[PDB]
């Protein structure tokens, strides 16, 4: 059980088309024959599936010891029905076009599941950042954008890179600075070419913790749904149950704190080295220190090394957040859990899905969970496309206008019950007192994220009941994804051909 | 005491770096040695200080008598950490690269003190507009932009000119029309290349009086601060004290009315010709007529000519708003005032500062006062970048929604106290009645300006206490300025070098 | 014996580097250590070898029956040391990135062997032109350029497509017309984006027969070299020996006529269907008719069907001109020939080379033979980059000036021997009479091609003796190729890295 990662995501898309194909002909309003309309649907589905562009590079670089190297680099743009196309830049010696093509596809559907205006994209670099000088990573990241930009694969109108595995705000700043100063110098939207930038360079409050909140608001939108918890046989709530984490990195890290702050007791955590198992809870603050002190989660003196993979650890909510294809046909029989959230991108093989549906354990699709990161990188790309600190124009104004609603209510009452002259004191609460001056930059993020992953969780529930998919929310997700991208191709007069 | 105007502003920047350098190493989070980190700070400070681009021109023109002339023209772009770069266009026979370089620097800090997304810039033209036909000024202004545009010094992504000395809305319209019709024709943001345009050409309510409000809200934010007025030995309030004005032009003019309407009695006013001294108040309306009738503030029959410079006149609030370096080591001993506001750009020599701190008289930095003009020209550049009359989308909607808050409150009460059926009339006040339909174009200006210069006045107070700078708010201003521009260079991975 | 076609061409490049590496260190003039210089050479060699860009596409098309299809399309740009990059566009259901990458590499060396200023490139389309309407091929070819152009893979400054397998002047006209009218409309060099265009659309006399002349002048430059014919044991001349042809298409066709007109008796010919064997000669005119009448070379009533592959036919000069990898380890033992020319691109597997060197049969590298086609498509790209019919400016002038050389010689003699008054008639010959008006468009082609493949044949001979490669001219060719591309990288300061 190790399919070509692109043949796998295609496999999910397949079961999606196998169910939509019927409810999609009846919504096609053209005037043709029944079979003809189906010969129209299946055709458009064959256009969605493949990637529309897969660039492939090679970089002469000069390492600090003067020697040269080549660096294969990739970038796919899955679909063009929606511009621009976002997608992270991954640094790993395990990246390939067969991987990038699929990760590129997912973000075409992630962005469709959470209603974000972007096509899919993804860029890889065969590289191990743990090997190279922090000068060499600059000469590599800047060259990698110099190559893309001149071939039309970076720019606020075509593609928007983003952080991903083994990349952070450090790299994303090198990109925005190279693009702004070479190609899109005159363009007013220069700095808006990448997301995940540092705050001082045009970022957004909580771009790092963005994905974590995703995993959080996702789990919350289901744990607090009794219709499934009655099936899974658990309790709506967090402090009553626990969870584990694969891949203590950005997702895994912030998936903890936001899920740790509400009573859910993070049992264990692991990484490429080993596992750290404590059935009583690990402080996400303290462990975060060792990643900056001891280089690994190992040695953590408030837990122990675990002779076994996290995926088999007894818990309540499994969260693979480290790499692809981790759960598989050989790990599925030994999960011993109830819910498998997904921070990583397609961490479950399609063979293991049936076993999970068979074992009666709910799998929440990665299309829905790690989509939080996108929906915040959208606010960033949209922040620095308007050139204004959101809400700055109307801080002093909203603060005044609200002080005149409450006043008018007061002045109005002091004429009806004011016969005694009694001063009715209409004053804000503690909560409203914060929201007087309006929506600050952080407020729309903590809301626009919690809202985007509210509508999405419904549209997934609303579908899985319409088609009776039970706990295969994944298939229900692709249905909502495919139905949306279809109406774009259908009405667009797909081509000039 | 007549330093090179660029060696002067550098001198202020110096005393700024001399205090930040310590509290800035500890905020640098890189992993190096102490001395190394200081070898990193001082280096970045040497990058901020100089101008990154100083163009220099020469114009063949054809005067109306057919003769040719050359016209030296300058433009500096101080820093590029923030695009675009705004900066006025000054017409004076006293402009030079040594001047423009410094005025360019100030606006890099002005924009940093009031948190406005622009680098600094400034453009000069060795010219005397009082000499040339109002046709020749067009052939000069249009040629001056034709030259800049083709070399990448005008355009909504690089630079945005603005009014300044001896230029008004007349000139700024010639620029926007030349740029829109030659270089950026196809660009959607063509007309957004300059600010200070006429309203019919995309201006903003009160762009002329914008700078005056700055000087006003600045003074107000300090006069109403007892912590200093206890030191200066005066009273928080305006009608109890007076003020004078140097340079009756745009700043000086509107600095009067907005400071005249609140009881502060404008004692005198002067210009290149002479002074007009009346210890009982000059009507800013009446005097404004003579500038359009008698060509000068002289002859004003409700005052007298003053055999002396304004800077020595007895008053309470001195406002130099005419030119640079006016106060100096020779004028400082004879100020006879309490507060010296600054409408002009660096009207005080650094030598006179010590004398002012010694004489125990508070000097409000020009970085803070005339920054109002920028913060409104930002709203303009941001108005005509969105292509919509701000608030037009939601006039009829907010008006309705507010009529349903007040109604719901009424309908809610008529069920609790409505046992008598008594019609509770929840109706807006007089004030709220204006703010029903929402934020109009003028409302955000009168607020966004009053708000921007609220946060700034605090950050300056908040610093001058943290470092104990007493009344040298100027040094406190640069500290806040330098700390902000530093975090941009620091995190940006300053160069690809 | 069926290596990955890119692992094969790499294999030749390898044996090339294995011999140059020594004679290339001594020509490196930098000041380093011996081993260091070798750590510099091997590094640059690792930069040359891989492709710098390999795009990959997918086309929604609308077949005439209304159904949709996807069409994978590829394009590689091997190297960028020389812009633009030429390369054909092949239509075949057997194309893939693993093929295009190598064919792209060859043209980086072809162009280096014949000193033509282009990097390598190649574009494929998984398609069978024998299946689609001649309308559908237009909707496919135009879309394929629309996709490339917007991503910077067509244009006289980056890439220049050209005819190749299953494409002719029909397709190349659709490309030039689509590019000229969409992307490079304003560009003055629009129509110069592709070569192989029809004459009326900016072609060159004999662009079709261009490659054939290549195969001809190549063979001639060796057959008339006794130094090898003494080794091979044959006779310098054509009418005394015969030859066969694989792949009667463009190359194979015109390889016949130009080699048929000089006595060499074309024995047989074959194609995807079958062979046509006549040991007495096939009229290239008559057989050309059946390709336009009977759809195949079969049925040709002046020969017979041959139960066997051409590659084993007894002859004197074998010319595979149909596809890749035709000769191989299984066909090498049964060649029964003396010289194997190569019209096709790498039609010989590296394993069969040793067998050919062992069997003492000379293999002429495809790098040298089919390079004629490029050297004419260069004249085209250079014709329509100058916007003038070459030689038109000086037809009437050269005709006059020559009539004054011959006259002056006459007038000069009629003073020395003119004592008798005898009219010396200095008049042109028959041959010169043609070349009076100068170099017409066709003359430079028939010369610039015959000349380009003169210098190249020497530099290959001049190398194979310097290094004693005997009859492995192929390895001698790559040596001259690598030595040239190396001096470009070496001196260029290879990167900004
Ligand atoms: N971080 C983000 O912004 C986003 C991340 N994701 C997904 O989340 C996943 C992880 O987040 P990242 O930020 O990439 O974390 P990261 O970039 O910090 O690295 C993940 C960590 O997991 C560990 N790990 C990697 N492979 C492993 C394996 N096979 N077994 C055990 N441990 C392993 C590594 O030590 C690494 O520290 C990624 O796979 C990505 O697909 C998706 C969207 C946004
Ligand atoms: N290089 C570029 O083109 C960049 C452009 N931008 C744009 O600027 C706007 C900034 O808004 P926000 O940062 O959200 O406001 P904000 O109030 O969130 O500002 C965040 C930080 O930026 C600093 N800052 C503000 N103005 C500055 C200036 N003129 N110079 C140096 N530092 C300054 C402030 O001190 C604050 O610490 C964004 O909308 C973005 O579109 C932002 C970053 C880089
Ligand atoms: N007006 C604006 O939009 C802004 C102005 N400023 C600063 O405000 C100052 C004045 O405002 P402007 O609009 O330029 O005024 P303005 O362009 O109307 O001219 C200033 C007036 O002051 C008088 N004056 C000039 N030099 C003088 C001297 N040495 N002694 C006595 N009188 C003199 C002149 O007669 C002139 O009428 C300028 O120096 C400029 O740096 C700063 C930001 C924006
Ligand atoms: N040349 C250009 O490209 C210009 C573009 N603009 C853009 O147009 C927008 C206009 O909004 P505001 O002026 O703030 O609205 P507004 O309500 O403030 O309009 C101000 C004046 O413009 C006049 N006006 C409005 N639409 C007009 C039209 N179609 N033709 C002639 N006059 C008209 C109105 O009568 C009004 O007196 C701005 O956002 C600006 O971005 C503005 C000026 C010039
Ligand atoms: N024609 C040109 O302009 C140039 C051609 N070449 C090379 O010359 C070769 C042939 O020239 P083209 O113009 O492509 O000819 P073409 O495009 O007319 O087709 C070649 C012919 O050979 C036959 N053929 C193909 N594969 C075969 C196989 N496996 N067995 C038997 N017969 C087969 C086909 O029936 C076809 O008619 C190509 O492989 C190409 O690499 C190289 C440079 C320029
Ligand atoms: N669409 C475009 O931009 C094209 C531009 N060109 C340029 O035009 C130049 C033409 O030179 P050659 O064709 O080598 O000269 P040529 O003497 O070889 O002309 C070849 C044919 O073109 C025809 N022709 C010449 N001028 C014409 C015109 N104004 N309208 C229609 N047909 C005409 C002639 O009758 C002749 O049959 C080339 O240098 C090429 O650069 C050529 C073809 C297409
Ligand atoms: N690595 C790390 N990041 C943190 C930590 N605390 C907060 N952050 C991030 O830094 C940002 C600033 O935190 P706050 O000032 O508390 O604002 P906030 O958004 O209310 O913080 P949260 O509610 O925890 O998301 C947050 O949005 C988080 O994304 C922490 O302890 N460790
Ligand atoms: N030169 C000059 N300008 C004026 C005068 N009165 C108003 N203005 C400017 O013209 C604009 C229109 O004035 P109003 O209709 O009163 O609107 P406003 O913003 O409430 O006016 P103010 O509150 O005085 O700023 C104002 O914003 C001022 O900038 C005046 O008497 N003389
Ligand atoms: N298919 C085909 N093409 C031909 C034939 N004869 C000539 N051509 C091509 O058409 C062009 C015009 O031929 P010519 O007028 O004889 O000029 P040319 O260049 O002297 O012809 P060649 O010397 O045979 O190359 C030639 O350059 C050939 O490329 C032919 O019989 N069949």
Beta carbons of A121 and A82 less than 8 angstroms apart: no
Beta carbons of B247 and B343 less than 8 angstroms apart: yes
Beta carbons of B249 and B273 less than 8 angstroms apart: no
Distance of CA A54 to CAs A23, A49, A108, A166, Å? 32, 14, 14, 22
**What angle in degrees, to the nearest 10, is found between the helix axes of C169-182 and C136-150?**
50
Minimal C-alpha gap between B274 and chain A (Å): 41
Mapped onto helix, strand or coil, the DSSP state of residue A76 is strand
Can you list the pairs that B466-469 forms with residues at least 24 positions away whose Cβ atoms lie under 8 Å?
B467/B19, B467/B23
Q: How far apart are CA B394 and CA B410, in angstroms?
A: 24
Q: How far apart are CA C95 and CA C460, in angstroms?
A: 31
Q: How far apart are CA C207 and CA C192, in angstroms?
A: 15
Distance of CA C228 to CAs B34, B355, C224, C232, C464, Å? 75, 99, 9, 6, 11
Residues C253-272 as b/e (b if ≥16 CB within 10 A, e otherwise) read: bbbbbbbbeeebbbbbbbbe
Residue C103 CB partners (closer than 8 Å, separation 6+) = C5, C76, C87, C88, C90, C122, C345
Is there an atom of ligand 5 within 6 Å of C171 CB? no
Q: How far apart are CA A215 and CA A196, in angstroms?
A: 18
Please calculate the CA angle C342-C346-C352 and round it to the nearest 5 degrees: 90
Q: How far apart are CA B114 and CA B305, in angstroms?
A: 39
Beta carbons of A151 and C53 less than 8 angstroms apart: yes
Q: How far apart are CA A305 and CA A299, in angstroms?
A: 8
Residue C486 forms contact with A (CB below 8 Å): no
Of B87, B18, B13, nearest to B55 by C-alpha is B87
* Number of residues that make up chain C: 497
For residue C396 the two structure tokens come to 């009437």
For residue B148, with 0-12 CB atoms within 10 Å meaning exposed, 13-18 middle and 19 or more buried, which class applies?
buried
Mapped onto helix, strand or coil, the DSSP state of residue C267 is strand
Distance of CA B169 to CAs A57, A290, B8, B166, B378, Å? 52, 61, 31, 11, 16
Please calculate the CA angle B483-B488-B491 and round it to the nearest 5 degrees: 115
Distance of CA C45 to CAs A280, A348, A447, C50, C459, Å? 58, 42, 55, 9, 21
Beta carbons of B271 and B291 less than 8 angstroms apart: no
**Residue A263 preceded by cis peptide, ω within 30:** no
Beta carbons of B361 and B336 less than 8 angstroms apart: no
Beta carbons of C363 and C469 less than 8 angstroms apart: no
Minimal C-alpha gap between A153 and chain C (Å): 8
Mapped onto helix, strand or coil, the DSSP state of residue B208 is coil
Q: How far apart are CA A245 and CA A243, in angstroms?
A: 7
List, in sequence order, every residue forming a beta bridge with A91; answer none if it has no partner: A125
Minimal C-alpha gap between C144 and chain A (Å): 11
Mapped onto helix, strand or coil, the DSSP state of residue C149 is helix
CATH topology of domain C53-201: Rossmann fold (3.40.50)
For residue B246 the two structure tokens come to 């140097």
For residue C301 the two structure tokens come to 């009533």
Place of tokens 């009539």: C403
Q: How far apart are CA B6 and CA C373, in angstroms?
A: 65
Beta carbons of B369 and B347 less than 8 angstroms apart: no
For residue B456 the two structure tokens come to 């700034």
Distance in Å from the first CA to the final CA of chain B? 40
Beta carbons of C106 and C346 less than 8 angstroms apart: yes
For residue C28 the two structure tokens come to 């490196």
Pairing of β A339-340 and β A317-318: parallel
Mapped onto helix, strand or coil, the DSSP state of residue A68 is strand
One-character DSSP codes across A350-374: HHHHHHHHHTT-EE--HHHHTHHHH
One-character DSSP codes across C312-343: GS--SEE-B-S-SS-B-TTTGGG---SEE---
Beta carbons of C156 and C381 less than 8 angstroms apart: yes
Neighbouring C-beta atoms of residue B392, cutoff 10 Å: 11
Beta carbons of C77 and C155 less than 8 angstroms apart: no
Given a contact as 3+ CB pairs under 8 Å, which chains touch B?
A: A
Pairing of β A242-246 and β A265-270: parallel
For residue B108, with 0-12 CB atoms within 10 Å meaning exposed, 13-18 middle and 19 or more buried, which class applies?
buried
Neighbouring C-beta atoms of residue A272, cutoff 10 Å: 8
Q: How far apart are CA B386 and CA B28, in angstroms?
A: 37
List, in sequence order, every residue forming a beta bridge with B317; answer none if it has no partner: B339
Residues A87-121 as b/e (b if ≥16 CB within 10 A, e otherwise) read: bbbbbbeebbbebbbbbbbbbbbbbbbbebebbbb
- Helix ranges (DSSP H) in C61-168: 97-113, 136-150
- Which resolution in angstroms does this entry have? 3.4
Of C50, C104, B495, C118, nearest to A68 by C-alpha is C50
Q: How far apart are CA C88 and CA B205, in angstroms?
A: 62
Beta carbons of C250 and C208 less than 8 angstroms apart: yes
Residue B60 CB partners (closer than 8 Å, separation 6+) = B68, B69, B70
Beta carbons of B427 and B402 less than 8 angstroms apart: no
Please tell me what DSSP assigns to residue B163: -
Contacts of A393 in chain B (CB under 8 A): 379, 390, 439, 444, 448
- Residue numbers preceding breaks in chain C (C to N > 2.5 A): none
Beta carbons of A367 and A344 less than 8 angstroms apart: no
Calculate how far, in angstroms, residue C196's C-alpha sits from the geometric centre of ligand 5. Answer: 16
Q: How far apart are CA A173 and CA A195, in angstroms?
A: 9
Domains A53-201 and A202-497 share a fold: yes
Residues C84-102 as b/e (b if ≥16 CB within 10 A, e otherwise) read: bbbbbbbbbeebbbebbbb
Q: How far apart are CA A89 and CA A74, in angstroms?
A: 9
C494 → closest Cβ in A58, A60, A152: A60
- Positive or negative, the CA dihedral A275, A281, A282, A285 is positive
Please calculate the CA angle C419-C424-C427 and round it to the nearest 5 degrees: 165
**Residue B84 preceded by cis peptide, ω within 30:** yes
> Rounded to an integer, what is the distance from CA C145 to the centroid of its chain?
23
Residue C466 CB partners (closer than 8 Å, separation 6+) = none
Of A97, A56, A99, A52, nearest to A77 by C-alpha is A52
Residue C143 forms contact with A (CB below 8 Å): yes
Q: How far apart are CA A325 and CA C48, in angstroms?
A: 36
Q: What is the 3-state secondary structure (H, E, C) of B4-52?
A: CHHHHHHHHHHHHHHHHHHHHHCCCCCCCCHHHHHHHHHHHHHHHCCCC
Residue C25 CB partners (closer than 8 Å, separation 6+) = C34, C37, C38, C41
Beta carbons of C252 and C318 less than 8 angstroms apart: no
Mapped onto helix, strand or coil, the DSSP state of residue A265 is strand
Distance in Å from the first CA to the final CA of chain A? 40
CATH topology of domain A202-497: Rossmann fold (3.40.50)
Place of tokens 């008796």: C265
Cβ of B425 within 8 Å of Cβ of A412? The answer is: yes
Q: How far apart are CA A99 and CA B58, in angstroms?
A: 58
**Residue C84 preceded by cis peptide, ω within 30:** yes
Distance of CA C366 to CAs B76, C49, C316, C347, Å? 59, 18, 18, 8
Residue A336 CB partners (closer than 8 Å, separation 6+) = A312, A313, A314, A315
Please tell me what DSSP assigns to residue A95: -
Q: How far apart are CA C175 and CA C180, in angstroms?
A: 8
Distance of CA B395 to CAs A43, A404, B389, B438, C195, Å? 47, 18, 11, 6, 61
Residue C224 forms contact with A (CB below 8 Å): no
> Rounded to an integer, what is the distance from CA B398 to the centroid of its chain?
33
Residue B405 has phi, psi (to 5 degrees) of -60, -55
Nearest-atom number in ligand 5 for the CA of C324 is: 39
Neighbouring C-beta atoms of residue C167, cutoff 10 Å: 24
Is there an atom of ligand 1 within 6 Å of A343 CB? yes
CATH topology of domain B1-52: Helix Hairpins (1.10.287)
Biggest CA pair distance of chain C? 91
Biggest CA pair distance of chain B? 91
Biggest CA pair distance of chain A? 91
Please tell me what DSSP assigns to residue A327: B
Residue C181 forms contact with A (CB below 8 Å): no
Beta carbons of B432 and A426 less than 8 angstroms apart: no
Beta carbons of B194 and A224 less than 8 angstroms apart: no
Pairing of β C265-270 and β C275-277: antiparallel
Please tell me what DSSP assigns to residue A393: T
C152 → closest Cβ in A56, A143, A151: A151
Q: Where are the domains of chain B?
A: 1-52, 53-201, 202-497
Q: Where are the beta strands (DSSP E) in A261-308?
A: 265-270, 275-277, 304-306
3-state helix, strand, coil in chain A (%, to 5): 50, 10, 40
Residue A198 CB partners (closer than 8 Å, separation 6+) = A169, A172, A173, B491, B492
Q: Where are the beta strands (DSSP E) in B289-418?
A: 304-306, 317-318, 339-340, 362-363
Q: CA torsion angle for C203, C205, C209, C210 (degrees, to 10)?
A: -70
Q: How far apart are CA B224 and CA B466, in angstroms?
A: 20
Q: How far apart are CA A121 and CA A87, in angstroms?
A: 4
Residue C429 forms contact with A (CB below 8 Å): no
Q: CA torsion angle for B105, B111, B117, B118 (degrees, to 10)?
A: -30
For residue B324 the two structure tokens come to 């640079």
Mapped onto helix, strand or coil, the DSSP state of residue A56 is strand
Residue B97 CB partners (closer than 8 Å, separation 6+) = B54, B56, B74, B76
Q: How far apart are CA B181 and CA A351, in angstroms?
A: 63
Place of tokens 């030119």: B323
Residue C179 has phi, psi (to 5 degrees) of -65, -45
Beta carbons of A97 and A74 less than 8 angstroms apart: yes
List, in sequence order, every residue forming a beta bridge with C318; answer none if it has no partner: C340
Beta carbons of C111 and C145 less than 8 angstroms apart: no
List, in sequence order, every residue forming a beta bridge with A62; answer none if it has no partner: A68
Cα Rg of chain B (Å, integer):
25
Contacts of B404 in chain A (CB under 8 A): none
- Helix ranges (DSSP H) in B191-233: 210-223, 226-232
Mapped onto helix, strand or coil, the DSSP state of residue A204 is coil
Q: Which residues line ligand 6 (CB under 6 A)?
A: C 191, 200-202, 383-384, 387-389, 441
For residue C456, with 0-12 CB atoms within 10 Å meaning exposed, 13-18 middle and 19 or more buried, which class applies?
buried
Neighbouring C-beta atoms of residue C462, cutoff 10 Å: 11
């Amino acid at each position: 059980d190790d399919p070509n990662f692109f043949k796998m995501v295609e496999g999910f898309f397949d079961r999606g088309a196998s169910i939509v194909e019927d409810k999609l002909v009846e919504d096609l309003k053209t005037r043709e024959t029944e079979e003809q309309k189906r010969n129209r649907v299946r055709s458009i589905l064959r256009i969605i599936k493949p990637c529309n562009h897969v660039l492939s590079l090679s970089f002469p670089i000069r390492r600090d010891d003067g020697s040269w190297e080549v660096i294969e680099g990739y970038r796919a743009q899955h679909s063009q029905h929606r511009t621009p196309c976002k997608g992270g830049i991954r640094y790993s010696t395990d990246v390939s076009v067969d991987e990038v093509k699929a990760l590129a596809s997912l973000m075409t559907y992630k962005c469709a599941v959470v209603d974000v205006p972007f096509g899919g994209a993804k860029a890889g670099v065969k590289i191990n950042p743990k090997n190279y000088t922090d000068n060499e990573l600059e000469k590599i990241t800047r060259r990698f954008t110099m190559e893309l930009a001149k071939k039309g694969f970076i720019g606020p109108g075509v593609d928007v890179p983003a952080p991903d595995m083994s990349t952070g705000e450090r790299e994303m700043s090198w990109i925005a600075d190279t693009y702004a100063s070479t190609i899109g110098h005159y363009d007013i939207n220069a700095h808006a070419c990448v997301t995940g930038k540092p705050i001082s360079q045009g970022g957004i409050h909580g771009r790092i913790s963005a994905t974590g909140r995703g995993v959080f608001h996702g789990i919350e939108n289901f744990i607090n749904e009794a219709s499934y918890m009655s099936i899974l046989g658990m309790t709506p709530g967090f402090g009553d149950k626990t969870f584990v984490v694969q891949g203590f990195g950005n997702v895994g890290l912030h998936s903890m704190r936001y899920l740790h702050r509400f009573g859910a007791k993070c049992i264990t955590v692991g990484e490429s080295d080993g596992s750290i198992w404590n059935p009583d809870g690990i402080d996400p603050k303290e462990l975060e220190d060792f990643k900056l002190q001891h280089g690994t989660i190992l040695g953590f003196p408030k837990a122990k090394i675990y002779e076994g993979s996290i995926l088999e650890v007894d818990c309540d909510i499994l969260i693979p957040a480290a790499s692809e294809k981790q759960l598989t046909k050989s790990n599925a029989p030994r999960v011993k859990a109830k819910i498998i959230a997904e921070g990583a991108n397609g961490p479950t093989t399609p063979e293991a899905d049936k076993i999970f549906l068979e074992r009666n354990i709910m799998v929440i699709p990665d299309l829905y969970l790690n989509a939080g990161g996108v929906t915040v990188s959208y606010f960033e790309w949209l922040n620095n496309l308007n050139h204004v600190s959101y809400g700055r124009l109307t801080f002093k104004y909203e603060r005044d206008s609200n002080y005149h609603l409450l006043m008018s209510v007061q002045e109005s009452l002091e004429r009806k019950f004011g016969k005694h002259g009694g001063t009715i004191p209409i004053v804000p609460t503690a909560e409203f007192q914060d929201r007087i001056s309006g929506a600050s930059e952080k407020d729309i993020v903590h809301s626009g994220l919690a809202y985007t992953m509210e509508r999405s969780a419904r549209q997934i529930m609303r579908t899985a009941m319409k088609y009776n998919l039970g706990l295969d929310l994944r298939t229900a997700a692709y249905v909502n994804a495919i139905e949306k991208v279809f109406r774009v191709y259908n009405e667009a007069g797909v081509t000039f051909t």
